[PDB]
Amino acid sequence: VEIVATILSWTGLATPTGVPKDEVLANRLLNFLMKHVFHPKRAVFRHNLEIIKTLVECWKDCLSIPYRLIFEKFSGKDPNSKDNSVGIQLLGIVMANDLPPYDPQCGIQSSEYFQALVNNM
């Protein structure tokens, strides 16, 4: 949290883009940060979501938005647990800017991606 807040604060100067390995590390950071973003504690949960949204609206140029885990995060069935909240709220984060949720060009077919989105609707 502290080191990423520090590097993100250094925006306008030292963007993480234009360098290959810097971009790859940024992408692993993003995928890892969405991968573990669910904490039994709601305040730090909101905080982590804010970290992710700051990361994605500050980098924005090594695009690489990881689908297929937001997808499997809302794709859960048996609606008796708030397990799908993470995927829909991550999707809301990525939508909160101009990012397009173009599904089936890297992951699972839109006809079932959006299907599970609606089923949890």
UniProtKB/Swiss-Prot annotation:
Autophosphorylated at two clusters, the T2609 cluster and the S2056 cluster. Autophosphorylation induces a conformational change that leads to remodeling of the DNA-PK complex, requisite for efficient end processing and DNA repair. It is found in: Nucleus; Nucleus, Nucleolus; Cytoplasm, Cytosol. The modification N6-acetyllysine is found at residue 73. Serine/threonine-protein kinase that acts as a molecular sensor for DNA damage. Involved in DNA non-homologous end joining (NHEJ) required for double-strand break (DSB) repair and V(D)J recombination. Must be bound to DNA to express its catalytic properties. Promotes processing of hairpin DNA structures in V(D)J recombination by activation of the hairpin endonuclease artemis (DCLRE1C). Recruited by XRCC5 and XRCC6 to DNA ends and is required to (1) protect and align broken ends of DNA, thereby preventing their degradation, (2) and sequester the DSB for repair by NHEJ. It is linked to Immunodeficiency 26 with or without neurologic abnormalities: A form of severe combined immunodeficiency characterized by reduced or absent T and B cells, recurrent candidiasis, and lower respiratory tract infections. Some patients show dysmorphic features, severe growth failure, microcephaly, seizures, and impaired neurological functions. DNA-PK is a heterotrimer of PRKDC and the Ku dimer (composed of XRCC6/Ku70 and XRCC5/Ku86). Formation of this complex may be promoted by interaction with ILF3. Component of the core long-range non-homologous end joining (NHEJ) complex (also named DNA-PK complex) composed of PRKDC, LIG4, XRCC4, XRCC6/Ku70, XRCC5/Ku86 and NHEJ1/XLF. Additional component of the NHEJ complex includes PAXX. Following autophosphorylation, PRKDC dissociates from DNA. Interacts with DNA-PKcs-interacting protein (KIP) with the region upstream the kinase domain. Belongs to the PI3/PI4-kinase family. This is DNA-dependent protein kinase catalytic subunit. The lineage of its organism: Eukaryota, Metazoa, Chordata, Craniata, Vertebrata. The chain holds residues 2187 to 2307 of 4128 of the full protein.
